Amino acid sequence: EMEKEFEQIDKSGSWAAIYQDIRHEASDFPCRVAKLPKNKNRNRYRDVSPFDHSRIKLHQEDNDYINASLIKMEEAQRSYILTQGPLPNTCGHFWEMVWEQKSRGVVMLNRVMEKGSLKCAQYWPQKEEKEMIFEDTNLKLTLISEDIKSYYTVRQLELENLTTQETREILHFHYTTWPDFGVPESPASFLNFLFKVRESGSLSPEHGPVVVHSSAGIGRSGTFCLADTCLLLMDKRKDPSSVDIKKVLLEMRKFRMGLIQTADQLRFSYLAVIEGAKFIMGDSSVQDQWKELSHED
């Protein structure tokens, strides 16, 4: 049982040790393409690169590289694309990926500016009347509407392939109060957000994988995906207590390095899954409780 595992770790003061063990056991795969000199301006951080085996390839002959990885969770039957916050010169690549991968939703867990420093480009329009055109990939992006809540914002965007003239509605789920290398204000606020993404239909297998990002696409991003996949497994398995969150995280790390960046983020992931499980195990009244507890504007 996760509650028992959580207490065992918490009471012994072993979070740093458990987390460091996961880091030590994590997969080590090559990232040769990410390191090619010509790709230097496509990486936000020198210490965060996608593995070659799981990287997302752009469908262009020029240069198919983007710092993004496909996290394919076989048993959970869900895939996610984790990517860095787009750079000024990779915003067109980012939307090209969204288009090509048939994604319906984009989950952003960081702010454009954090601690007086730029952590992600302003890759979507802030005003309806000021749409964006990405010349390099021939895509147009328009803000259709946005619903701003106390700690997160949901936006409806229209993405158009200017080559084929076809358009698609993309849902943007922006968590605006999650500090870098920090944790959500509470399991409640996090789960309320996660279930909003779920209820939107964006994570449905009928769509391409949801695109999840933070500044590097590994810390807050890994937390989001780890919680979601664990809950998926608990709903799917005969014995939900058989889900080992540490093993799920190691499985995810076979696809992208460094998922979950701090011991406290790992600790928070346990709390988020333990709380979310109360809903999966029936008692769907907790969902309204998180809603109320989140104080979403």
Binding site: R44, Y45, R46, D47, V48, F181, S215, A216, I218, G258, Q261
Partner: peptide, 8 residues
């Protein structure tokens, strides 16, 4: 060079 992680 820009780094995401802490090495201090």
């Amino acid at each position: 060079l820009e780094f995401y992680m802490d090495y201090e």
